Structure formats: C-alpha cells, structure tokens
C-alpha cells in the first residue's frame, strides 16, 4: 500500500501569518489519464473532515481561496496564504490513486497567541450525588495559552493524587485558547471526614500558582 | 447540497456484527458518486474501508479481509455498511464520505457515528448540577456547570438553557474508567445575570433513551 507522510506533525502559527505543510507518497500519483487523485482535508475540533484541495492543485467546492494545492509525481504541498483562528484543526491528505486509497498521518495546526492565565474555578460535590455515597470535587481552568499546564489538589493542606482525572480541550477557535478539567474522586465518608479543598493551577503566565478553596458545609 | 447522515447500533458485543446505515439527500446515489466507509480510531488515524458506486460496483480494504459488506437500496436512497467477527480494536467513528467518482471531487461526509464494541452494560448517568461557591461569586463573570457521571457507552450531548446558551461554555472530553464514563461542562455568564437568568444542563443518553434538565440553584438560600 501507499505510503503518505505528512510533515511537520505540527505547526504553531500567528493569525495572518502563512502556513505550508507537506505530504510525500511512496509511489507516484499521476493516473493513466493525466489526473492526480490526491485531496487535501482539514478536520476542526469535534467535526468531520471536509474538503479542501482535490486533483492535487485544485480548490474543491466552496473551499475559500486562501488554500493552495501544489505538486505532483510523489511530492506535494498545502499553503495557507494567511492563516485565520477558525483554520486550527488536523490537516490530512489522501490518495485515490493507488489501491487501497490511503490517507497521511494529519498535521495539527495550532494557533500562536498571546499568553493568558487560566480562570480558575473549583466546586463542592452536589447535595445529589452525596446521597449516593460518592463524592466529586470539581477544578476548571478555563481560557489559559499555552495548553502546558499543571493542576494539584491539596485536601486539608495536603497534597492528594489518588482520585485524580483530568480532561482537556482542544484549542478554542473562538479565542485561542486551552481549557481543562480536573476531577477528584473520593467516598462521600472520605469527603465528610475532611474540611478544605484546594486546586492549585501552575501555568507560566504566573511564578504564584492560582489556588482555589472551599470549606465542606461552608457555602 | 449533497448531505449524508449515518445510523445504526452505537455498541455492539465483541464477534457480532456492526451495522450502518448512510442516508443520502440532495442526489440520487445512482449518479455520479462512490459511496465510501472510512473509519477513524481513537489515535485520530483515518482508514479507508471501502465503497459502492453509483452503478453497484464495491470496493474494500484488503486489511478487513472478508469481514466487510457493502451494499445500498436505492429505492430508499441509502447505502450501507456491515463488519462482522468484530473486536474492541474495531471500536472507532465511522463516516460515510461521497467522492465524485470522476475526479475525487465535492468530498461530502457525514457527522460520523461512534461504535464501541464492547460486553459492558449500558449504563444511565447521573447528573450532578456545579453550583459556585459563594466566594467566587463578587466578581463580574462567574463560572457555573454540570458533572455527568457514570454512563455508558459514549456519547452522551450537553447544551446549556435547551442550546439559547452557547457563548462561555467549556465541554470537555468524557474520561473513561471501570466501564463508566465522566463528563464536565462549563459556562460562565455576567455574574449580575445570575441567579436572575435560571441556568440549566441539558443532558441527553440516546442509548439508555435518558434525559436530565438540570437547573444549578445556587449553595446558599433559594
């Protein structure tokens, strides 16, 4: 089978700016017919891939035409004459040519931006889910750039890392930006045997990590 | 113009069979286009497994070495797929994708639908409402959500106010464990909108047929 491999694996990017990527097959593409069945996707977030380039050099239906296809033989290129936020997303390229068609292993463009601190914010487990005997003490830190991040759970002082799970988003096309989740899981008697609970996010907008609190029975 | 919407089981016991169904609108399947499946696994990795075109005529991945079935009905305009002897390794999206046949062109997909193959039980979940506490609540913006915990298979939606609240909302990606998943969303409004303007979490679990309508109320009086 064909071969397609895409490079860089990924590209940071500042809005306006340009943006190539590449994809080499290990046969050649052209067909008997003079066409080149090689197409170009990008995927965003959450959505399903959709069309961008097709026939190596061509801009698919309703495709705006700041993408540019070019190439041919084994060797082809993507550009991105100026790079918007809503382009983020996993590029890929695939190839008709060659049975079975084939597609490349995607390069993720992400979206170069000024830093910010996380909004940190963090929630007692609900009354409902007490009287079930769990427990869960909710952390989220919304709308940080870069996406490296480091989230610790302190209960009565102490640091805790049994119970921990943690959830990130993709990058926000809105704004740039990163968020996460983190969850810490314990017994509802744990919970009730103990009184502060703090999240403490370390990012590099600051050299003092965000630290939230809250005191059990207290609102 | 052309659109493609999938159906079919979301969860399926390891060595039966998965089943899907394409459902095409805006052109007739026995013009112009191939009809393909093609997968996605949980690494982000996309595999083309086959298609059907508009005459009839199949083609499939040799790596699904007799497992696969690709057929259509076109009295009712759809086209559809069946894998057979499957595994937890066959658990991925699955899209339908329309190619022209010509020349690659017009690549139109459906949303995707997940499959899970797996001998777990479908579980109902719980949904827990994130009420602020009331020292972060002085600011100008506060920050409100909902846990959903414990359900099974994915996926579960979430929408805020019935889908009218869409702006400030964070919903993160389920973790799995034990079976169970756990999923989180946030929104953040105008801290003096709240409580005055009621929040509430939409949950839905198609393959338990659950829905909650969670109203946060806040810690404190109400």
């Known amino acids: 089978d064909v071969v397609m491999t895409q490079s860089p694996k990924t590209i940071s990017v500042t809005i306006g700016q340009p943006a190539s990527i590449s994809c080499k097959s290990s046969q050649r593409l052209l067909n008997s017919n003079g066409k080149t069945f090689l197409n170009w996707l990008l995927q965003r977030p959450g959505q399903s891939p959709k069309r961008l380039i097709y026939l190596g050099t061509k801009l698919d239906s309703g495709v705006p035409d700041r993408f540019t296809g070019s190439g041919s033989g084994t060797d082809f290129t993507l550009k991105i004459s100026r790079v918007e936020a809503e382009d983020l997303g996993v590029y890929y390229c695939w190839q008709g040519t060659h049975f079975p068609y084939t597609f490349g292993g995607g390069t993720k463009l992400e979206i170069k931006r000024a830093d910010a601190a996380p909004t940190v914010s963090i929630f007692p487990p609900s009354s409902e889910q007490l009287t079930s005997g769990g427990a869960s003490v909710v952390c989220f830190l919304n709308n940080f750039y870069p996406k490296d991040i480091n989230v610790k759970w302190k209960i009565d002082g102490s640091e805790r890392q049994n119970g921990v799970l943690n959830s990130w988003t993709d990058q926000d096309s809105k704004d740039s930006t990163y968020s996460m989740s983190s969850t810490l899981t314990l017994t509802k008697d744990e919970y009730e045997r103990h009184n502060s609970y703090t999240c403490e996010a370390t990012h590099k907008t600051s050299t003092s990590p965000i630290v939230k609190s809250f005191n059990r029975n207290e609102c | 113009r052309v659109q493609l919407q999938q159906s079919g089981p979301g969860l399926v016991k390891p060595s039966q069979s998965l089943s899907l169904t394409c459902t095409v609108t805006g052109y007739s399947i026995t013009s112009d286009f191939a009809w393909n499946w093609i997968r996605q696994f949980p690494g982000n990795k996309l595999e083309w497994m086959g298609y059907?075109?508009?005459?009839?005529?199949?083609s499939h991945n040799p790596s699904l070495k007799s497992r696969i079935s690709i057929t259509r009905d076109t009295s009712k305009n759809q086209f559809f797929l069946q894998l057979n002897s499957v595994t937890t390794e066959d658990t991925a999206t699955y899209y339908c994708?329309?190619?022209?046949?010509?020349?690659?062109?017009?690549?139109?997909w459906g949303q995707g639908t997940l499959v899970t193959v797996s001998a777990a039980k479908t579980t109902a979940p719980s949904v827990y409402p994130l009420a602020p506490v009331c020292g972060d609540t002085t600011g100008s913006s506060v920050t409100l959500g909902c846990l959903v915990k414990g359900y099974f298979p994915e996926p579960v939606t979430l929408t805020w106010n019935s889908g009218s609240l869409s702006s400030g909302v964070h919903t993160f990606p389920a973790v799995l464990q034990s079976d169970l998943y756990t999923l989180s969303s946030s929104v953040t409004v105008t801290s003096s909108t709240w409580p005055s303007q009621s929040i509430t979490c939409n949950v839905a679990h198609p393959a338990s047929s659950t829905k909650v309508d969670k109203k946060i109320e806040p810690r404190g009086p109400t």
């Open positions: 994708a329309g190619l022209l046949w010509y020349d690659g062109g017009a690549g139109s």
């Open positions: 059907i075109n508009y005459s009839g005529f199949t």
